Amino acid sequence: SKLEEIEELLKELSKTNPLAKDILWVIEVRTEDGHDPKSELVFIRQYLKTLNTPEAREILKIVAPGSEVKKEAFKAFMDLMDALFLAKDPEIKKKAEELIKKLEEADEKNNEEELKKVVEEAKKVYKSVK
Amino acid sequence: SKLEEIEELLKELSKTNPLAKDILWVIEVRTEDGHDPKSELVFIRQYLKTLNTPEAREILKIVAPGSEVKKEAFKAFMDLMDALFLAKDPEIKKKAEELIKKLEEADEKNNEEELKKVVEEAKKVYKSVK
Amino acid sequence: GEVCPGMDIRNNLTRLHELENCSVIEGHLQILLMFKTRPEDFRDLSFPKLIMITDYLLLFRVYGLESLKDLFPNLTVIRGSRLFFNYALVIFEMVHLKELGLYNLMNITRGSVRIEKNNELCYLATIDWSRILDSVEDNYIVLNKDNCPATVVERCWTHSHCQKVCPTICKSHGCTAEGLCCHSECLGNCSQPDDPTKCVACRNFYLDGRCVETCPPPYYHFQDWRCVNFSFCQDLHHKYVIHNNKCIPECPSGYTMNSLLCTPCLGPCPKVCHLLEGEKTIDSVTSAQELRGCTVINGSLIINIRGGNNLAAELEANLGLIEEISGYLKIRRSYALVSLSFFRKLRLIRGETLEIGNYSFYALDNQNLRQLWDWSKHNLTITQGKLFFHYNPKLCLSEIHKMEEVSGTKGRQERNDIAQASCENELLKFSYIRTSFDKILLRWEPYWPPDFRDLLGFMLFYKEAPYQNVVVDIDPPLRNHPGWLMRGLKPWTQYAIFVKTLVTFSDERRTYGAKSDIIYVQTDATNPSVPLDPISVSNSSSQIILKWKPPSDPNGNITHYLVFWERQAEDSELFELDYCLKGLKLPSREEHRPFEKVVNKESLVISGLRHFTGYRIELQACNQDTPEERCSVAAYVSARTMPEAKADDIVGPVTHEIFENNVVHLMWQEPKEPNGLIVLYEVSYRRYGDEELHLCVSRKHFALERGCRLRGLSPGNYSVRIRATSLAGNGSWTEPTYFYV
Amino acid sequence: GEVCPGMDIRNNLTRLHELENCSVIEGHLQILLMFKTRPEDFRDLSFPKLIMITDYLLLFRVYGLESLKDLFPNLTVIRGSRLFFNYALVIFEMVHLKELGLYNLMNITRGSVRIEKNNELCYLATIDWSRILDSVEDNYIVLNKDNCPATVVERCWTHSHCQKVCPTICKSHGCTAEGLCCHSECLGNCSQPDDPTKCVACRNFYLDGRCVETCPPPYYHFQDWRCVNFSFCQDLHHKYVIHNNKCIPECPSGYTMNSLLCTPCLGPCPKVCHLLEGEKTIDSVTSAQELRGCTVINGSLIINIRGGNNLAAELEANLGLIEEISGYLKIRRSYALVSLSFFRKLRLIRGETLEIGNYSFYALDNQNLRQLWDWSKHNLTITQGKLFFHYNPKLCLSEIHKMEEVSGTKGRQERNDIAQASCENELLKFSYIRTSFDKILLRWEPYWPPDFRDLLGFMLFYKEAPYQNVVVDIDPPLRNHPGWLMRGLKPWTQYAIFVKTLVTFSDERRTYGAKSDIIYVQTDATNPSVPLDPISVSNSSSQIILKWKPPSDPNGNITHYLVFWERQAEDSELFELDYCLKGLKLPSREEHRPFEKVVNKESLVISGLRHFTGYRIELQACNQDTPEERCSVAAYVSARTMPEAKADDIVGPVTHEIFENNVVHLMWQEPKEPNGLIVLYEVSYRRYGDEELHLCVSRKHFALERGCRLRGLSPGNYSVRIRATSLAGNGSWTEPTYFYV
């Protein structure tokens, strides 16, 4: 799958990077585990947040398109686009009204961190809607 | 004088020790100063006590016979044995009675620090008598 | 082609009618939640003037739209200056859309396509986005219903609205509605071909109905899009600043206003950080790092630092950003910190934000500090509010005094605010010092506390002090004047030195303290180290561009390069050896040395020398230039100059004499300034009709045979040539000699 | 020769007459301090038996003595075991002595002379002190009044009491009263010459009227001067111990009693320190350094020390001497102290000395504990008294309970004995781990505090853990199991790993956190580094005592030395080119390589080889053998065996054939196991009357000419011999060959 493609291009990168090689080690040990690939993936992404060297950040972005976060934020925006008028409570609609403005802002300012916080909050609110 | 010969043989010692050469500089410095030779002498002796490396101690002993202290020790003996029977106050005589035992025990112990303290006491007692 | 700003429209389409006077939307168009609208609203409601949207489009629950061409059939470009999720258009969840059919779209300068859930909406896969959008990573198109140029199938928005594929030669600049390219400054379309004034969108800038490469002020550059007069720049500014002749919304980093010119600032910018809640508590480095650069502020601050050793370097880089604090600042329970000074600019707590109790500063449980500020050369002041210091008696009122005095806060506190007691009641004084280059005397006197017993000696701390950016103990004297010497120092090295007493801790009457003085002190200079990189490079036969580099140990203010050289008497082995074997065996290698105090030059062009001659070099490094000097042991090299192709030659032809028995005797002369030294002479000779033969003559052979001698020669006219060989190599041959044998 | 203990005559002359029973004074004699004495008390008193005083003499303020000879005419020796300020005596201000006149004084084993201000005392400078005192340069003879042999003045104590002359051959051992030397074991004098039983004093040991170099038990060695039975040794012991068969007052360091034998102890000795008032307080290392060695104690002590980082190594080196404390130990204002475990041996506070209120311990202001005691095994009990632990809530009651139980103070304490707190109130656990040689995985759970918000992540601290004689943070997880991996550990290296949670401090009852667990984990072994010191030493022509040394990186429990070698075929050039230019040009220098897993042997003997033959060596050093093996890239060397100067011979005589034109061909053969290889041959030939001459035949000359072909041989009987030259050298010549030409 495209995750296997990620792994193979990571073979490529590790051939151009030691850290990618360590990630491949992580990958094979996880294969030994064979548990939820996405869970281990997200953990490793957070591990990149941890090590967070410039090279680590680059590798993360490569495996973590970041614009990945952009698409996910777009989906959350569709969620809120439903919620702000079709939510089950006026309070939810008002919070979504705040949040659409907040998202327009974040989009202009286009900060990965601001957008992460916004989307997490959007999920929190959409809990009430769904 | 024994001071001058001390310097002259310290020439040899410094030729056998950098720190003795340092002391020779110090001697030059004092020469410029031209003040009480014994003053700077005893100061530098205490300076040896300060640096007090094994080599520093050896050098100090060489320039400071230490057994010197034993010479003032028998002098302080004369002082104490004079005071014990001729001291102006019975308290001074009893202090000398303590200090003779202290002398004998320090002789056995033959430590020069115990003896330094003892001779300080003897000086105080002798000053009280005279 | 007019221009108007782009806004959003929620459930009220009435504002769409305002687009009739617009050809460009300086922004986007966002239409959302139209439960009010119907097909009658949008089936042919059209604004053909509109030809481009800078940012993007949006269309959600837009009940009634039939074809996207209807509203803006002429719409051609989307600059995508800002793009919602990097997208250009939202078409989601409208069943009325039968098609898009926009028969004028040419290019999307930035972004991809989104369409979804729009029932009845056909002709989506038929679009060849490869030529339209600069970004086609994911033209999101799902859950919808879906003659003309074909690419791999016909490409078209509708079977009639054929895709407006311009000829490839038109580039992104676009083509007219008939398919004829536009000018390079144009983008997308133009009313007439190849005319910068007839464009619809500009590659560089739209200026007064015409595209221009650059914007002429007061019509400065506008966001790489158009030109706006300086008055409108100010209008945007006030409700935007000139940079690179561009009225950008704000100046770049390191810039400052010049009334609306973006003149560079001092680099750092006085950013007015209106603090979150006007506040931020500080205990750990991460907090400050987060807020680095708040050169200006609005708020107070709270401090609970966790410092306990020599590690403050991590900290002030974030600190000191301002000379004042409008509100208060609070600190409590801070760790074993010693210095309360490392805050660069700070000078005045305006205290406008009052700490509880109408305070404007607080300090308690900070029973740690022993350094606060250099008010001696630093200015303090405080505006208003009570200030709290109590329960921090590590440093007692001694310097507090100074603090409230310089703050001018005498009337703003009481002793209630203030209270291990490292508060030196005395400051000892140095008496005498004497200096070597590495070992320096000190002297002082039999100082004693009134209970002289309390004294336990003296604790020194020092350090090398090359610059003024900002370690042993002693025992008591006797009743007498002490001193000190060290060695660890180095020549001409400044050091800061300072002592405080080693004293008894008299508990209840714990002696409050006997400090000492401070001194920046530099040792004596001395003879430096050898100067390195000695390379005697030759620029010319008799010229040597010598070069060195400073020593490892300047050991004083450097004064001169005491250079020294001398010509070398060439080796006697060359005068003793003989090398005349075919396949030449040529060898290979008082006195006041002439000198100079070469100063500021790490090199020298030495003249008067001899090409390829042995020379011994010498250079003492000297940070002194008097007759007596701190001069290092010299650097040296046995330099040899560069040769000449004249000094290994032989002048004139070979002198010769002959005998009746076919014996030839030869003689010649050599230059007296050879390439170092001539050691042998190559010899060649020939008779007419025969062939030339080679021979060697060494200096010993030269002496024994007055040069060269030949025997058993064939009769007839004869010739001889000889070439002198020096240690630099062979020179020039002799002039062809001739004689009869 | 009687003997008496050293005794004092001070303030009273009544004890003088007991000296009559004495010949040896085991100690000193002290006469002083009674002004009442007059000449009538001493002018005629005599103790002739007196011979020797071990330590010294004295006379001042006991006025009256007229001559030392009368009192002790036979006084001869002074061992000077201990000396009067290194003087054997002092006579001062004695206006009564006319002379010492001691005509038997011969030796003073130690010390110098001091006699000052003694009026009427003559014949002091006349004394031949050089042969008497072992130290005369320290003599102090000033301000006194001052027929016999003269040495440079007449040497004598009086004009009649002449120097007791002992020939130089007598040494310090002494001579009889007549001047005849004594036995080597004697000292000073002897009743008869050359008899150890007639000595007056003994060099080594007095033994029952005789002198012996050694003391036979039970009459052990006594203070290097006599012998005493074990009975008297015990008598001295009970108001003394046998060491090296010597009854010394006490054994030297590292010794213990064995009832009176000086049995060695564990080195440290149980010294019972009755401290100053049985007390001490501690704030600086100097105190403990002073108080080193108190493996036993009598007193109590106090503690107050600083601290700023992991810097306590300086401390316990002086600490933990006893297993208990008779009284109390006190700690106050040691803010930074990390533990109370710094005392090795201590096991119980006897608390016999009680703090006020019958207390036995106190604790205050030490809010810096990471550890306290190895309670796991530290059975640190407490005997009696109450205790105090306030202002130390940094560590909480949860372990104060533990201290109480192990102290057994459950019935001796109250909450009044006890007081930022960092007492992690939960336990963190590890879910999974994986190990490489350098990179090691970790896992654990998505833990949350009940106020899950409070979590801020996790602070790991590890170290390498080869022995247990005694570092990064994380953020919170979420909904699951976190983990960790590092990069650069070393193979097969154990590490101690443990974590504490990063959490927000809540100033109410704080979320103290879930303390993690400690793990000592070793990384994977890996391929080691190359084994070094590869030396292929040749024990014989075909034998090589190879030797290496371990690699730089074992990278695991080493397993074997997989050696690999081969016999290298000699270079082709040596097999091709001719080397018979006079002034010899002799040169100089599947695939199963034979192998072996040499184990535990850093060296090897290799057989089946060839002298001076080339061999390419190899060794894949391995810490794994049976499966695929973790082995370094092998070490290597192109070893060459030691040569044999026999495998360069030419077997048999010189095969030859003759021609009529004085030309003779030569053929021969070479050994088939040469020194690497044979490149050329040396040919020697002679004729009668002539002399032998040499020629060379290369391999190519050998092949073309089938060896050698001598030409122009002198007519007559002719002989030839040949010797082959190998790269190692030359061997045996051919057997003589003869022929006629």
Swiss-Prot record, chains C, D:
PTM comment text: After being transported from the endoplasmic reticulum to the Golgi apparatus, the single glycosylated precursor is further glycosylated and then cleaved, followed by its transport to the plasma membrane.
Domain Fibronectin type-III: start-end pairs: 650-741
GO cellular component: axon; caveola; dendrite membrane; endosome membrane; external side of plasma membrane; extracellular exosome; insulin receptor complex; late endosome
Top-rank taxon: Eukaryota
Keyword Ribonucleoprotein: no
Chief place where the protein resides: membrane
Mutagenesis / variant outcome for changing residue 671 to L: In RMS; impairs post-translational processing
Subcellular location field: Cell membrane; Late endosome; Lysosome
EC numbers: 2.7.10.1
Record text on activity regulation: Activated in response to insulin. Autophosphorylation activates the kinase activity. PTPN1, PTPRE and PTPRF dephosphorylate important tyrosine residues, thereby reducing INSR activity. Inhibited by ENPP1. GRB10 and GRB14 inhibit the catalytic activity of the INSR, they block access of substrates to the activated receptor. SOCS1 and SOCS3 act as negative regulators of INSR activity, they bind to the activated INRS and interfere with the phosphorylation of INSR substrates.
Extracellular side: 1-589, 590-741
Keywords attached to this entry: ATP-binding, Carbohydrate metabolism, Cell membrane, Cleavage on pair of basic residues, Diabetes mellitus, Disease variant, Disulfide bond, Endosome, Glycoprotein, Isopeptide bond, Kinase, Lysosome, Membrane, Nucleotide-binding, Phosphoprotein, Receptor, Repeat, S-nitrosylation, Signal, Transferase, Transmembrane, Transmembrane helix, Tyrosine-protein kinase, Ubl conjugation
One GO term of the biological process aspect: positive regulation of cell migration
Phenotype upon changing residue 115 to M: In LEPRCH; mild
Glycosylation sites: 12, 21, 74, 107, 189, 229, 258, 298, 358, 379, 469, 539, 557, 717, 730
Tissues showing expression: Isoform Long and isoform Short are predominantly expressed in tissue targets of insulin metabolic effects: liver, adipose tissue and skeletal muscle but are also expressed in the peripheral nerve, kidney, pulmonary alveoli, pancreatic acini, placenta vascular endothelium, fibroblasts, monocytes, granulocytes, erythrocytes and skin. Isoform Short is preferentially expressed in fetal cells such as fetal fibroblasts, muscle, liver and kidney.
Disulfide bonds, paired cysteine numbers: 4-22, 148-162, 166-175, 170-181, 182-190, 186-199, 202-211, 215-227, 233-247, 251-262, 265-269, 273-294, 396-423, 580-696, 622-631
Gene Ontology terms, MF aspect: amyloid-beta binding; ATP binding; cargo receptor activity; GTP binding; identical protein binding; insulin binding; insulin receptor activity; insulin receptor substrate binding
Effect of residue 136 to L: In IRAN type A
Assembly and binders: Tetramer of 2 alpha and 2 beta chains linked by disulfide bonds. The alpha chains carry the insulin-binding regions, while the beta chains carry the kinase domain. Forms a hybrid receptor with IGF1R, the hybrid is a tetramer consisting of 1 alpha chain and 1 beta chain of INSR and 1 alpha chain and 1 beta chain of IGF1R. Interacts with SORBS1 but dissociates from it following insulin stimulation. Binds SH2B2.
Family: Belongs to the protein kinase superfamily. Tyr protein kinase family. Insulin receptor subfamily.
Domain note: The tetrameric insulin receptor binds insulin via non-identical regions from two alpha chains, primarily via the C-terminal region of the first INSR alpha chain. Residues from the leucine-rich N-terminus of the other INSR alpha chain also contribute to this insulin binding site. A secondary insulin-binding site is formed by residues at the junction of fibronectin type-III domain 1 and 2.
Annotated function: Receptor tyrosine kinase which mediates the pleiotropic actions of insulin. Binding of insulin leads to phosphorylation of several intracellular substrates, including, insulin receptor substrates (IRS1, 2, 3, 4), SHC, GAB1, CBL and other signaling intermediates. Each of these phosphorylated proteins serve as docking proteins for other signaling proteins that contain Src-homology-2 domains (SH2 domain) that specifically recognize different phosphotyrosine residues, including the p85 regulatory subunit of PI3K and SHP2.
Disease implication from the record: Rabson-Mendenhall syndrome: Severe insulin resistance syndrome characterized by insulin-resistant diabetes mellitus with pineal hyperplasia and somatic abnormalities. Typical features include coarse, senile-appearing facies, dental and skin abnormalities, abdominal distension, and phallic enlargement. Inheritance is autosomal recessive.
Name this polypeptide is given: Insulin receptor
Top-level taxonomy: Eukaryota, Metazoa, Chordata, Craniata, Vertebrata
Gene responsible for this protein: INSR
